[PDB]
Amino acid sequence: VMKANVTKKTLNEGLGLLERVIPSRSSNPLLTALKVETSEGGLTLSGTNLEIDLSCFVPAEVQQPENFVVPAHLFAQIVRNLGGELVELELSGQELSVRSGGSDFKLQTGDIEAYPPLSFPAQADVSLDGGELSRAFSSVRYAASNEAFQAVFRGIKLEHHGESARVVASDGYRVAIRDFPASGDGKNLIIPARSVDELIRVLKDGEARFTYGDGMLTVTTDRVKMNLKLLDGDFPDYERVIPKDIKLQVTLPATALKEAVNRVAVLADKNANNRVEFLVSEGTLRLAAEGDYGRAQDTLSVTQGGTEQAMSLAFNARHVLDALGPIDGDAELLFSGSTSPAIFRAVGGGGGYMAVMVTLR
Amino acid sequence: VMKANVTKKTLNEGLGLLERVIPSRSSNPLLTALKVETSEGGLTLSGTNLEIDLSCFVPAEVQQPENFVVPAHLFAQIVRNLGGELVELELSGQELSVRSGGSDFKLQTGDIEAYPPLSFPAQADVSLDGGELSRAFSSVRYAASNEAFQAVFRGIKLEHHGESARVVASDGYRVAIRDFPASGDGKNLIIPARSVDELIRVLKDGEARFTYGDGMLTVTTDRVKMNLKLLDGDFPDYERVIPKDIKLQVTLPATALKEAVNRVAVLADKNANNRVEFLVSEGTLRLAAEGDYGRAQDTLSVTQGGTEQAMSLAFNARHVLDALGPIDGDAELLFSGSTSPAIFRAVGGGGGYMAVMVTLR
């Protein structure tokens, strides 16, 4: 019979990744299954949620390899709860045995013949660092909206520029951009935002390889392969909504600003777009909000420069916090005018991140 | 005008206790309010959820003391978010100012005149150690059920026995008991289980004083005063369901047993009472469960004694884990028969805790 010896730690890692993708509930009885393919070198764990496919390799010693399906979440739970560090798998008839020390678990297996063949192409069309790509994704993802009229804005654009690459998200008004190092000569892609979320969960430091397909992308890392759909169309010209006529620059500690926006926003009305006023004057930034319960003000010392010495602006506090999220150390706020867009970034644009914010009307 | 200076740490502690009791939403507009009473020595924070009343004293420096009401959760949230270590309160008209460092918050106060006078009687009728009482409560609370036919079983019985006291909870079948040290003699009481939960949240090491009332109890500690209802009726004779004829005793590590029951129970049927089979023989305990998805077994080494050398029983795994919760180190399991009740306790009954468990049909 088929028998495999595998490390619990490694099997846990793979199953943890797959259980977050595979649905726990479905009217399709096989959609909740994990497919396990065995060969000499180890186990390949795979599944789908119909928007992405995921495969993870787990090194193992296997005899008499055979493929099977089991309920993904139950199997992950059983393995997690096992006491020992080394796991024995055995497949006999329609029963998977999962053993470690005094523990002996049996799972009924499913209809492997009815589970779809999942194919992951390998051609290394582009290569970049997965950690760089993941942190870039995480820095811009908030700006994409599934509800935008333009379908393209529901995804994240990836651009290649030789020695570097860029990811961009937007709703047509706010924009988030992060530039990062790339081994870079590839094509522009638009990745669905929910697929970026899955990518973030699997990418680690080290090389990530892209294989281009027809309306799809395959991303391969150390041990993981993921299929995802790509959006059609050209991402819009976001450069046009980035302000270049800056009148006022304010520099201040990022953490103080985040904590000040957070605390003041509690008194903004439940829905007047979480309104927060920014008043720059005399080397200070005052934040103000007001609603039915009361009113809040917080005042911060800042360094200010430019052709205006004072400015009053209104922003969605939640969007402010979204935009500031990736900024650490000191923030630089660049204002084009009291009712026109602003840029938030780290000092000098260091790290490659930039947010464009619109004011409330 | 009224003005108070208070440490943020101490104000946070008091507000944290009150916000747990005061509802965050109600059709009664004042029920969600915190009452704040000021005097020279500090602030008294009070409120109600209609089942309990709670009052907490926070030391502060106050000028021109005056009372007011404010929304409890909003106020607690504003204070938590403050950046500095000192809070300044100021009351002018219907506006409470809350200030720390660069932060200045204004809250609209409510109709203090329409907030009920809450009264906390002081007569020290009995005195117990709050830490002992809290740990006893926590050891038996799980056994009480709000869904029991007999209203008395929805509460926790407190019994006085001179230098010792006892708390007991039950659903008429399972029983949890903890004996603990008591300072002098008192009245037997039945405390509603949800009020025990609130008491657990406020009790600390040190003295807790009881003031008896008509169908109610007031508990006073260093920090707080709490009013709660008491249940009427006679707590039933739980002694009669405690097995006296023990045939088999097994001793083993409580943590190993908890982890084994937990892992095996995953394969019990979604509702056959979380069935786990216990098989004792030849110095081992084997746990087994089985359902539609598969089957599980775990085996543990135990020490064993008594008139029977082997026994097979079935238990609700959830009730097993409830019963083992308070046991640290070695657990002693005492069986009266394959389908009659069992006792779970620490070695020798040490610590004063005992659980009585019924078997499944």
Numbering used by the authors:
A (entry chain A), B (entry chain B): 1 to 361
Paper text:
The crystal structure of Drβ-clamp was determined in space group P3221 to 2.0 Å resolution using molecular replacement. The asymmetric unit contains one Drβ-clamp dimer (residues 1 to 361 of chains A and B), with 292 solvent atoms. Despite our efforts, the DNA oligomer the Drβ-clamp was co-crystallised with was not clearly visible in the electron density, and could not be modelled into the structure. The overall structure of Drβ-clamp is similar to E.coli β-clamp (Ecβ-clamp) and consists of a dimer which forms a ring lined by 12 α-helices, with an opening big enough to accommodate dsDNA. Each monomer consists of three domains (A, B, and C) with identical topology. The shape of the Drβ-clamp dimer is slightly more elliptic than that of the circular Ecβ-clamp, with an internal diameter of 32 to 41 Å. Drβ-clamp displays a strong negative electrostatic surface potential on the outside of the ring, but a more even charge distribution inside the ring on the DNA binding surface and in the dimer forming interface. In E. coli, M. tuberculosis and T. maritima clamps the positive charge forms a relatively continuous band pattern across the surface whereas in Drβ-clamp the charge is more spread forming small positive patches separated by negatively charged areas. The Drβ-clamp dimer interfaces have a spread, even charge distribution compared to the very strong positive (N-terminal domain) and negative charge (C-terminal domain) of the Ecβ-clamp interfaces.
The bacterial DNA polymerase III β subunit (β-clamp), and the corresponding eukaryotic and archaeal proliferating cell nuclear antigen (PCNA) are ring-shaped proteins that encircle double-stranded DNA. They act as a processivity factor, or a sliding clamp, for a wide variety of proteins that act on DNA including DNA polymerases, DNA ligase, endonucleases and glycosylases. The structures show that the bacterial sliding clamp is a head-to-tail dimer, where one of the interfaces is opened by the clamp loader to allow DNA to enter the ring interior. In this paper, we describe the crystallographic structure of the DNA polymerase III β-clamp from the extremely radiation resistant bacterium Deinococcus radiodurans (Drβ-clamp).
